Design an enzyme around this catalytic site. Structure first.
Site, PDB file in Angstrom:
ATOM      1  N   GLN A  98      62.112   1.691  30.291  1.00 53.30           N
ATOM      2  CA  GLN A  98      63.201   2.144  31.152  1.00 53.30           C
ATOM      3  C   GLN A  98      63.090   3.649  31.368  1.00 53.30           C
ATOM      4  O   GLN A  98      63.293   4.437  30.438  1.00 53.30           O
ATOM      5  CB  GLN A  98      64.574   1.754  30.606  1.00 53.30           C
ATOM      6  CG  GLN A  98      65.673   2.133  31.587  1.00 53.30           C
ATOM      7  CD  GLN A  98      67.086   1.860  31.107  1.00 53.30           C
ATOM      8  OE1 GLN A  98      67.584   2.437  30.124  1.00 53.30           O
ATOM      9  NE2 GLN A  98      67.741   0.947  31.806  1.00 53.30           N
ATOM     10  N   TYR A 177      74.185   8.176  35.305  1.00 54.66           N
ATOM     11  CA  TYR A 177      73.138   9.177  35.159  1.00 54.66           C
ATOM     12  C   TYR A 177      72.704   9.677  36.534  1.00 54.66           C
ATOM     13  O   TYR A 177      73.433   9.477  37.510  1.00 54.66           O
ATOM     14  CB  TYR A 177      72.008   8.630  34.286  1.00 54.66           C
ATOM     15  CG  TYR A 177      72.486   8.373  32.868  1.00 54.66           C
ATOM     16  CD1 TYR A 177      72.956   9.414  32.080  1.00 54.66           C
ATOM     17  CD2 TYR A 177      72.510   7.090  32.336  1.00 54.66           C
ATOM     18  CE1 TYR A 177      73.409   9.196  30.792  1.00 54.66           C
ATOM     19  CE2 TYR A 177      72.962   6.858  31.046  1.00 54.66           C
ATOM     20  CZ  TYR A 177      73.411   7.917  30.282  1.00 54.66           C
ATOM     21  OH  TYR A 177      73.865   7.706  28.999  1.00 54.66           O
ATOM     22  N   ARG A 224      67.713  -1.229  37.150  1.00 57.13           N
ATOM     23  CA  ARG A 224      69.040  -1.532  36.628  1.00 57.13           C
ATOM     24  C   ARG A 224      70.084  -0.793  37.457  1.00 57.13           C
ATOM     25  O   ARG A 224      69.931   0.403  37.729  1.00 57.13           O
ATOM     26  CB  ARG A 224      69.221  -1.127  35.164  1.00 57.13           C
ATOM     27  CG  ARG A 224      70.630  -1.484  34.707  1.00 57.13           C
ATOM     28  CD  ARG A 224      70.980  -1.097  33.294  1.00 57.13           C
ATOM     29  NE  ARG A 224      71.091  -2.252  32.412  1.00 57.13           N
ATOM     30  CZ  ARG A 224      71.784  -2.274  31.281  1.00 57.13           C
ATOM     31  NH1 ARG A 224      72.498  -1.233  30.885  1.00 57.13           N
ATOM     32  NH2 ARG A 224      71.751  -3.364  30.521  1.00 57.13           N
ATOM     33  N   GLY A 315      72.431  -6.946  24.801  1.00 56.92           N
ATOM     34  CA  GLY A 315      72.320  -5.661  24.145  1.00 56.92           C
ATOM     35  C   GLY A 315      72.754  -5.667  22.695  1.00 56.92           C
ATOM     36  O   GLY A 315      71.918  -5.665  21.785  1.00 56.92           O
ATOM     37  N   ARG A 316      74.072  -5.671  22.471  1.00 60.16           N
ATOM     38  CA  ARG A 316      74.600  -5.517  21.118  1.00 60.16           C
ATOM     39  C   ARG A 316      74.191  -6.665  20.201  1.00 60.16           C
ATOM     40  O   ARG A 316      74.054  -6.467  18.988  1.00 60.16           O
ATOM     41  CB  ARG A 316      76.121  -5.332  21.149  1.00 60.16           C
ATOM     42  CG  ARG A 316      76.544  -3.939  21.599  1.00 60.16           C
ATOM     43  CD  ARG A 316      78.038  -3.823  21.888  1.00 60.16           C
ATOM     44  NE  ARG A 316      78.417  -4.376  23.181  1.00 60.16           N
ATOM     45  CZ  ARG A 316      79.628  -4.269  23.713  1.00 60.16           C
ATOM     46  NH1 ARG A 316      80.605  -3.634  23.085  1.00 60.16           N
ATOM     47  NH2 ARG A 316      79.866  -4.813  24.904  1.00 60.16           N
TER      48      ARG A 316
HETATM   49  C1  FMN Z   1      68.783   2.835  29.572  1.00 57.59           C
HETATM   50  C2  FMN Z   1      69.909   2.289  28.736  1.00 57.59           C
HETATM   51  C3  FMN Z   1      70.106   2.578  27.381  1.00 57.59           C
HETATM   52  C4  FMN Z   1      71.184   1.989  26.709  1.00 57.59           C
HETATM   53  N1  FMN Z   1      71.432   2.239  25.371  1.00 57.59           N
HETATM   54  C5  FMN Z   1      72.507   1.634  24.738  1.00 57.59           C
HETATM   55  C6  FMN Z   1      72.758   1.877  23.396  1.00 57.59           C
HETATM   56  O1  FMN Z   1      72.026   2.628  22.770  1.00 57.59           O
HETATM   57  N2  FMN Z   1      73.828   1.283  22.765  1.00 57.59           N
HETATM   58  C7  FMN Z   1      74.659   0.438  23.464  1.00 57.59           C
HETATM   59  O2  FMN Z   1      75.612  -0.091  22.894  1.00 57.59           O
HETATM   60  N3  FMN Z   1      74.422   0.186  24.799  1.00 57.59           N
HETATM   61  C8  FMN Z   1      73.350   0.781  25.434  1.00 57.59           C
HETATM   62  N4  FMN Z   1      73.116   0.540  26.764  1.00 57.59           N
HETATM   63  C9  FMN Z   1      74.005  -0.399  27.521  1.00 57.59           C
HETATM   64  C10 FMN Z   1      73.441  -1.785  27.185  1.00 57.59           C
HETATM   65  O3  FMN Z   1      72.081  -1.839  27.556  1.00 57.59           O
HETATM   66  C11 FMN Z   1      74.153  -2.954  27.853  1.00 57.59           C
HETATM   67  O4  FMN Z   1      74.066  -2.850  29.260  1.00 57.59           O
HETATM   68  C12 FMN Z   1      75.599  -3.090  27.391  1.00 57.59           C
HETATM   69  O5  FMN Z   1      75.689  -2.718  26.034  1.00 57.59           O
HETATM   70  C13 FMN Z   1      76.033  -4.537  27.538  1.00 57.59           C
HETATM   71  O6  FMN Z   1      76.849  -4.895  26.448  1.00 57.59           O
HETATM   72  P1  FMN Z   1      76.340  -5.997  25.398  1.00 57.59           P
HETATM   73  O7  FMN Z   1      75.515  -5.291  24.348  1.00 57.59           O
HETATM   74  O8  FMN Z   1      77.523  -6.679  24.754  1.00 57.59           O
HETATM   75  O9  FMN Z   1      75.457  -7.008  26.097  1.00 57.59           O
HETATM   76  C14 FMN Z   1      72.042   1.133  27.390  1.00 57.59           C
HETATM   77  C15 FMN Z   1      71.837   0.861  28.724  1.00 57.59           C
HETATM   78  C16 FMN Z   1      70.776   1.435  29.380  1.00 57.59           C
HETATM   79  C17 FMN Z   1      70.562   1.149  30.823  1.00 57.59           C
END
Ligand code: FMN
Length: 362
Positions: A98, A177, A224, A315-316
């Site tokens: 990314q 961003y 994204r 993600g989480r």
């Molecule tokens: C480039 C990038 C880096 C990300 N880093 C984090 C992160 O470090 N911690 C976090 O909780 N979400 C981060 N996110 C957001 C998650 O990728 C995700 O879109 C969001 O947490 C969705 O919630 P979920 O984890 O319940 O699926 C990031 C998103 C992007 C695009």
């Protein structure tokens, strides 16, 4: 109409399932933004994911203000990403990088330069530095020379990503961003060709996307977007007029796939009131559409069952469950993740999340 366990092709990337590891910054690089060997172990543990989207990785010193975050503009950073990627490939996984430019979400003590954005705005709240949180500085409205340089950075980062062995890249055009700052009218107050009408506000996304497409190929280019949330003070009053055309542009440009992060009305970190545009975006982007946010196993199956999405990014749940696709397939309960170690240093809360009953109980 597939399930999460059915394979999918993201351009030339044969993904063995539709369970994607969403991008998640962990801050496990060094102060030179070079990835540390521990990151190889973190991504390797999760290689059963159909596709891994790496944490945000800076395209330049200017665009990377988050402390201990990795970069991909320099040869040293490239050499460090190589064994990380190889370790996922050794388990048959697939992984994209990314590409990140943080725009105004940056501190000059880290980047060495004033925050830059579409317009000379100041983000609300506090920004991280190597010396704790500080008030956000006012951004500099970038000019045409800045755009050309930033376009060069994106290309070199996308090329470096491929040098490192990545199966592709994901353009970070979301989360308030740099690119998102151009897309949304709450932060884009420009009176030139990059502000005003929706077509103008997508121009930076277009030109970023064109360079990456020309750099590594459209079949290896994903994006994204975050069309409805209010992320870091970045909102558009009428998202439909911008994000639907932006997704149509991505289609016309040939980007291999699109991920949408869509907060709902009820959500922990960063929720919203604005509704999701995935149904409208689905009608204009026909290639693989990835939906992400508050997805359970059940809801994720429902989205694929209802033809509403091709794949689901998690993600989480992937923080605390290296074997998320195995627990989905085997009906195992999921491990909760510890926020304290989201951005901390070391393997604690990082590579010590177990996959099975093999820890202090075997
Ligand atoms: C480039 C990038 C880096 C990300 N880093 C984090 C992160 O470090 N911690 C976090 O909780 N979400 C981060 N996110 C957001 C998650 O990728 C995700 O879109 C969001 O947490 C969705 O919630 P979920 O984890 O319940 O699926 C990031 C998103 C992007 C695009």
């Amino acid at each position: 109409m597939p399930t999460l366990f059915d394979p999918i092709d993201f351009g030339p990337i044969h993904a063995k399932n539709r369970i994607v590891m969403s991008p998640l910054l962990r801050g496990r690089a060094d102060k030179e933004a070079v990835p540390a060997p521990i990151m190889a172990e973190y991504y390797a543990q999760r290689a059963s994911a159909g596709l891994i989207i790496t944490e945000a990785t800076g395209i330049s010193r200017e665009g990377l203000g988050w402390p201990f975050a990795p970069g991909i503009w320099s040869d040293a950073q490239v050499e460090a990403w190589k064994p990380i990627v190889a370790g996922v490939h050794a388990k048959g996984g697939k992984i994209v990088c990314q590409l990140w430019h943080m725009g105004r979400m940056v501190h000059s003590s880290v980047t060495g330069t004033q925050p830059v954005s579409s317009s000379a705005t100041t983000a609300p709240g506090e920004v991280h530095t190597y010396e704790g949180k500080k008030p956000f500085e006012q951004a500099r409205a970038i000019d045409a020379a800045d755009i050309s340089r930033i376009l060069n950075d994106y290309e070199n980062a996308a090329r470096n990503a491929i040098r490192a062995g990545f199966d592709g890249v994901q353009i970070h055009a979301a989360n308030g961003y740099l690119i998102d700052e151009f897309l949304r009218n709450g932060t884009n107050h420009r009176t030139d060709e990059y502000g005003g009408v929706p077509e103008n506000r997508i121009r930076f996304l277009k030109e970023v996307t064109e360079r990456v497409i020309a750099a590594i190929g459209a079949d290896r280019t994903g994006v994204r977007l975050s069309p409805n949330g209010d992320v870091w003070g970045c909102i558009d009053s009428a998202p439909e007029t911008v994000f639907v055309p932006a997704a149509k542009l991505l289609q016309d440009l040939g980007v291999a796939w699109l991920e949408l992060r869509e907060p709902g009305p009820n959500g922990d970190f960063m929720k919203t009131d604005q509704p999701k545009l995935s149904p409208q975006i689905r009608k204009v982007f026909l290639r693989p559409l990835v939906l992400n946010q508050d997805y359970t196993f059940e809801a994720a199956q429902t989205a694929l069952a209802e033809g509403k999405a091709d794949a689901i990014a998690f993600g989480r749940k992937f923080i605390s469950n290296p074997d998320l696709p195995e627990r989905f397939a085997r009906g195992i309960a999921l491990q909760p993740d510890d926020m304290k170690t989201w951005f901390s240093q070391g393997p604690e809360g990082y590579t010590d999340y177990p996959s099975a009953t093999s820890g202090p109980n075997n």
